[model samples]
Target: DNAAKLSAIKFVLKDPLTGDYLVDEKEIEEIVKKTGIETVVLKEYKEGVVLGPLYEFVTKDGRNAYVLSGYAPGFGNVTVVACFIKTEDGFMLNSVRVIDYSQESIQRRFFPVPPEGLKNGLRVDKDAGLPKGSPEELKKQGIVKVSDVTPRAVVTALNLMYRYLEEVSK
Candidate 1:
């Protein structure tokens, strides 16, 4: 079931220098063959997590790097991790990051994704009339007509807070 789901999703990455796509299945197979590996295996060691191939590469700084991309349960984001080979027998995780490529959170409220048309109803521009001079200023005004200001500005401020909270929580 997991394999079928993974195969259903298209995986594509661009070469940063040339903007050309890299690492199709054929190329990936060739690399694994070079490593003398006959089969690529994915193990779901944890519930709600789907792991992908562990790709090996040489970084520009002459360091050996290994990366793997996956999705975690309950999180609507794809996570990627890059690890550096410290020695022949061990590796160190250089970075672990998540990419909300789906833009679900943005769409959950305002600013739906493209093709669905932008949520233009929400006035995000500072010039948009609100109870205060600026969205920042409006917060200070306090207890004004809710309709006087755009709900979009409040939503924007909340979004900023959400981002800050996520960062701090991490």
Candidate 2:
């Protein structure tokens, strides 16, 4: 179930990271060099779960940040980065943000789940900055179905994954 749910989120290698415009391979290369890091790809087979490494970085505020990047079936590849602070023995997730790049027509086919609750239901409208009519249009045109259960399942899986990570970090 987790694997199937994770299929709802697809990861496109070409998608850009958060806090920027389109990201090209050149940018990725530059980032890798600048951060003194190598790209690490991870895969998993479970419902509503993401497969990737937990990226740790320092924010402009001098706080530690953890980023989880991966693909969801219908949502395509997404990057979720959260700023954190270290406590006595563990880290506390202060805030969470997500970067999604599957809104364009060119990227929809690879979307693993149908866009049903993406707006009012999933509240992606506020989180991801998607256009207002986009989800409705997709639903009306049969591109996505309102009753599709895949998206919700994916969300559940992802939340579980995050919680699991939180526990492990402690």
Candidate 3:
């Protein structure tokens, strides 16, 4: 597949200054190398070339995955975090993490990683939290934490891979 069809991926950002475009490119491309859309032919969404950067990573189970952060104030919150899982295939939309300091009861979360796989202080397993409480309980009990959660053409970027997954080949 060629760049036109294979790398039709275009992205978005909230406060993307002219200087911050490819800020994470090297970092992002490195991980994608292991398990994502490996062949990233960079170019300007408006014209040509990856004007800046696109990085930002997290590791688990002795592997690395790239995280892309998007922002949109219209969504009533802050950043939307999209975590990608590396697979033999190109990429999978494995996580939709969020960071919402705006809402007291909300923060985009990731699905639980097993206790054995758990690093840091991850505690979202079904037995420990998340689905265990009702919305009412979530309110009264006061949400300690929750899961990442969304999409778009290129705006709300958690939906980027989702919107064009049909056109992107593995």
Candidate 4:
């Protein structure tokens, strides 16, 4: 049931810069009311809080979820996307990835989402603190001080996403 419900959810993001809807304004607010963690906490990351477009990831089955976006400032800057999908167990880190997009030469190293950090999958209420270790795992992968920002961005984004989902579910 959890897996099937997750299949129906969709997401649309709100613009971080203009504070306007890049696509559907009505749906963006509808979705925003369901979520939180706004730019307040995320803005602390400096280059890490580059919020982009909002997503509307809900399904006809009445299932729902949210999508958040950000860019990690580092050797070459990385794009991080995270999805907070609700399950029978509760909302969790259903999806997260960090991809490097920098020019050649320094060539920016490739780093995974640290299998041991937010390993496998994470439940927001249960593993809320686990995301903090993702940076350490990134260090183990040889990511430089700049690239390390990527994990923090992703983790913080996840936190924000989780808060919004809770508001709606209530």
Point to the candidate with the largest lDDT.
Answer: 4
Pick the TM-score winner: 4
> Which candidate order results from sorting by TM-score in descending order?
4, 2, 1, 3
How close to the true structure is residue 149 of candidate 2, measured as C-alpha lDDT?
A: 24
Please, what is the TM-score per model? 0.32, 0.35, 0.32, 0.37
Model 4, span 1-170: residue lDDT tens: 22211221222222222433333545544555565324233333443453533444553344454465554444254545555445564553434444444521111222222323232332321234323434334433323223322344445444444444555568
RMSD in Å for all candidates: 14.6, 11.5, 13.4, 12.8
Query: lDDT of candidate 3?
Result: 0.33
Per-candidate Cα lDDT values, in order, are 0.33, 0.37, 0.33, 0.39
In candidate 1, what are the lDDT values of residues 1-170, reduced to their tens digit?
Answer: 23322221212122323534344555544554465342233444233233435456554445554444444354553342222233333333232233444552221222111211111222343434433443333332221123432233333332232222223325
lDDT, candidate 3, residue 45? 30
Cα error, residue 15 of model 4, in Å, equals: 26
Q: Model 4: how far is 90 from its true place, Å?
A: 6.4
Model 2, stretches more than 4 Å misplaced?
Answer: 1-40, 43-45, 51-53, 59-63, 71-74, 77-79, 104-170
The predicted structure with the larger TM-score, 3 or 4, is 4
Evaluate model 3: give its TM-score.
0.32
Alpha-carbon deviation at 165 in model 4, angstroms: 5.7
